[PDB]
Design a protein around this ligand. Structure first.
Ligand SMILES: *[C@@H]1O[C@H](CO)[C@@H](O[C@@H]2O[C@H](CO)[C@@H](O[C@@H]3O[C@H](CO[C@H]4O[C@H](CO)[C@@H](O)[C@H](O[C@H]5O[C@H](CO)[C@@H](O)[C@H](O)[C@@H]5O)[C@@H]4O)[C@@H](O)[C@H](O)[C@@H]3O)[C@H](O)[C@H]2NC(C)=O)[C@H](O)[C@H]1NC(C)=O
Ligand SMILES: *[C@@H]1O[C@H](CO)[C@@H](O[C@@H]2O[C@H](CO)[C@@H](O[C@@H]3O[C@H](CO[C@H]4O[C@H](CO)[C@@H](O)[C@H](O)[C@@H]4O)[C@@H](O)[C@H](O)[C@@H]3O)[C@H](O)[C@H]2NC(C)=O)[C@H](O)[C@H]1NC(C)=O
Ligand SMILES: O=c1c(O)c(-c2ccc(O)cc2)oc2cc(O)cc(O)c12
Ligand SMILES: O=c1c(O)c(-c2ccc(O)cc2)oc2cc(O)cc(O)c12
Ligand SMILES: *[C@@H]1O[C@H](CO)[C@@H](O)[C@H](O)[C@H]1NC(C)=O
Ligand SMILES: *[C@@H]1O[C@H](CO)[C@@H](O)[C@H](O)[C@H]1NC(C)=O
Ligand SMILES: *[C@@H]1O[C@H](CO)[C@@H](O)[C@H](O)[C@H]1NC(C)=O
Ligand SMILES: *[C@@H]1O[C@H](CO)[C@@H](O)[C@H](O)[C@H]1NC(C)=O
Ligand SMILES: *[C@@H]1O[C@H](CO)[C@@H](O)[C@H](O)[C@H]1NC(C)=O
Ligand SMILES: *[C@@H]1O[C@H](CO)[C@@H](O)[C@H](O)[C@H]1NC(C)=O
Ligand SMILES: *[C@@H]1O[C@H](CO)[C@@H](O)[C@H](O)[C@H]1NC(C)=O
Ligand SMILES: [Cu+2]
Ligand SMILES: [Cu+2]
Lengths: 344, 343
């Protein structure tokens, strides 16, 4: 009944789960998966999971597609390469480092490879419930000490025979996919923009796209102190998956501004990337979250949040087309900085 | 009074300063500098400064040498290129992204260039007091909202002026040409950068670089698990007499007494990830989050532990056997950024 839990609840309720909590941990070879938000806990709205893993010289999974789930790759720390292709379009790949984002809509072939020793991927998958696949293929991990991954080259995860057998989990093998190997400066093909210029969201649903940290479109909202929304997924890209995804960066709330109360139709969640954010959900205590910590708010439940740190940034997901990030966008203005103004 | 302060104190005392606190802020063009530890606040042991800045197509400073200060570049977030050269050794450069490190000994020519929009560099300079340079070069900033930085010529002093700063220990090197053959964030070719192990320089006076996670590590199991990744040891510091490293931490099991420490030299840390509780001398325990800095005067007892399941701090100590060396010495060589899954 307490707000903070060590594994996501088995039903919809408000909760906070700290970074590297047990969270129904499993390993798949060297990778350790944690399920901070699950299907049961979000009423099937989304999954928010963390994967920690060491450098590997091999792919982290064979190339595959999902026909009914939209996958979102966010780099919390370290780095990992992501490859994706839609239909007939040119195959794209990027090396994501901290704060970088990669969108993989339904029916886009993809795979990834962990580069740096202390790498963390946060996956947001829509709708929720996809994690059964990781329960199934994974091995339960007790991880008493809560170490990020278990200390310790074939492709990780199911072999080619096994991954061709997983249609029930919405996984479909793409064994003809060949990850391109002409990466230079973290990108291929060469005619792309990655850490060198602005990144746009895709013009329509179904196409993969990547946003490097700080380089995507941003909006300043000035209504409750300053907040900068960096959209990753909007209605345009979500369509019938019916969600949004962004980061929200926040200043403190000035003493003359009342911290607003929110209550949305759809469930939402965030994970703190930088800073110290206080969340007050329902009748529970105002609780301060630090890096990697996750807060989950059921639809229809009132909550307040504010940044106790002078600057905080969170990864934010909402079920619905009108969640917090979109509300702040709609109420704000186009903005060209990762910083907010120096004056109120 | 309070352990927490909004600017570094003007004398030595235990303190914490939150990330993006005013910290005597100045701007140099687009860059904003915050002085979390100063000469006065550390009794001249070291300076620890944060620099927040947007992408620039121009150098962040003209190339220069310090004859008396050892400079340490740590990338908190975003990315910046660092160039360095000792003597007639090969000129080295690396693009540092989050958690990466560059070592700039005395008499090493260097410059940097900001790449990513949300870039933060943490400078650790030994000895302390180097900040007087930025008081002269920089313009005071009120920054009422504490924004990281205020929303193509080389940034900072021009060729004339940078040749005029020898009294701050800054010597111009205007003939230095930063090399322009960078590939995958490094040059020359056949350097190792996020693709394999990085060793500390074994020769004093040489620059070196350690990519996040790729340096030597030591596991200490004496008080919970702590992993120390050295960045500067006695080999490199010599008479500058300090150590620098990250320390990663498990929680402290309830069966282990959180140790009380005391060391003759001042030390400090800035939280990079997680949530670290520090109790210094006579003050209340305070929990630190991302970018927060704790300063402990030499000779003052303190305790720390991780409230988070994993935390990582950047740690600097005056003297040759401060906390990080003590943890190494009591620990073992270790090959992982993660600690064991069992106590
Ligand atoms: C992968 O990424 C790297 C970046 O990490 C890319 O590297 C860049 O590559 C381009 C193309 O090769 C280089 O741009 C060229 O630079 C030439 C050399 O420039 C020096 O010499 C000039 C003449 O003597 C001089 O004018 C020039 O100064 C100018 O730029 C300075 C910036 O360093 C600045 O301080 C000066 O005031 C002045 O404006 C240089 O000293 C130049 O002759 C060309 O015309 C061209 O601009 C970049 O310099 C490279 N950058 C780095 C940091 O190495 C690489 O191409 C990427 N690879 C792929 C395949 O994408
Ligand atoms: C900059 O960093 C890049 C990584 O981000 C480096 O890219 C790597 O480049 C090497 C050498 O060119 C590639 O390794 C080669 O790959 C080819 C192709 O491999 C694929 O096809 C074969 C044959 O059908 C198959 O057997 C493989 O499994 C692959 O599917 C091999 O033929 C070579 O023998 C060799 O392994 C890397 O693949 C490539 N990695 C990536 C992720 O693109 C790049 O070299 C760096 N640049 C510089 C100048 O240093
Ligand atoms: O289908 C899969 C998948 O989408 C991903 C994934 C997506 C986002 C993340 O953030 C992390 C992993 O990994 C996998 C690993 C396997 O071993 C087998 C799979 O079928 C998948
Ligand atoms: O001498 C200088 C110096 O060392 C550095 C620096 C070192 C470490 C950091 O983390 C940040 C800045 O910047 C400078 C900027 C100037 O305009 C002028 C200078 O003379 C310096
Ligand atoms: C994905 O592809 C499958 C198989 O062709 C198709 O039936 C389905 O409608 C597609 N889904 C989307 C959202 O494109
Ligand atoms: C992609 O190309 C193939 C030709 O091989 C074609 O059959 C298919 O319809 C194309 N897709 C679209 C969206 O038109
Ligand atoms: C759970 O994990 C352990 C090792 O962590 C493994 O040996 C075991 O088979 C798994 N499943 C069961 C039934 O315990
Ligand atoms: C989108 O989600 C919102 C919030 O959960 C919900 O109210 C709405 O019914 C959804 N729209 C559709 C078409 O499913
Ligand atoms: C740095 O260079 C100066 C000038 O050449 C020299 O006098 C001094 O000894 C050097 N210092 C170190 C530590 O190498
Ligand atoms: C800038 O702040 C400094 C302290 O570093 C102070 O002495 C000085 O008065 C300020 N400069 C101006 C012009 O106000
Ligand atoms: C190194 O610093 C320590 C603590 O500040 C001090 O005790 C000692 O005198 C110094 N050692 C040398 C060799 O100067
Ligand atoms: Cu997938
Ligand atoms: Cu310098």
């Amino acid at each position: 009944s307490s707000l903070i839990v060590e594994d996501a609840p088995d039903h919809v309720r408000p909760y906070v789960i700290r970074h590297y909590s047990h969270a129904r941990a499993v390993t798949v070879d060297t990778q350790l998966y944690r399920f901070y938000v699950t299907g049961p806990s979000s009423g099937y709205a989304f999954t928010l999971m963390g994967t920690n893993a060491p450098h590997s010289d091999a792919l982290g999974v064979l190339p595959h597609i999902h026909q009914k789930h939209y996958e979102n790759f966010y780099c919390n720390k370290g780095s990992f390469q992501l490859w994706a292709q839609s239909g007939n379009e040119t195959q794209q790949t990027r090396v994501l480092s901290s704060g970088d984002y990669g969108s993989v809509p339904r029916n886009v072939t993809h795979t990834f490879q962990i580069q740096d020793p202390d790498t963390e991927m946060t996956g947001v998958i829509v709708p929720g419930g996809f994690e059964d696949l990781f329960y199934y293929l994974g091995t339960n991990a007790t991880d008493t000490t809560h170490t990020p991954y278990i200390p310790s080259s074939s492709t990780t995860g199911p072999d080619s025979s096994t991954i061709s057998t997983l249609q029930s989990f919405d996984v479909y093998a793409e064994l003809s996919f060949t990850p391109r190997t002409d990466t230079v400066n973290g990108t291929a093909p060469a005619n792309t923009v990655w850490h060198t210029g602005a990144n746009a969201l895709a013009s329509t649903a179904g196409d993969p796209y990547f946003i490097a940290n700080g380089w995507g479109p941003k909006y300043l909202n000035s209504q409750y102190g300053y907040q900068i929304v960096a959209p990753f997924v909007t209605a345009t890209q979500a369509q019938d998956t019916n969600y949004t995804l962004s980061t929200i960066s926040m200043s403190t709330t000035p003493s003359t501004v009342t911290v607003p109360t929110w209550s949305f139709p759809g469930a939402c969640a965030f994970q703190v990337q930088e800073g110290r954010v206080v969340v007050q959900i329902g009748d529970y205590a105002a609780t301060e979250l630090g890096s990697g910590d996750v807060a989950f708010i059921p639809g229809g439940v009132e909550f307040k949040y504010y940044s106790e740190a002078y600057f905080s940034k969170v990864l934010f997901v909402s079920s619905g087309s009108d969640g917090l990030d979109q509300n702040l966008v709609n109420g704000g203005e186009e903005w060209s900085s990762v910083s907010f103004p120096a004056d109120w």
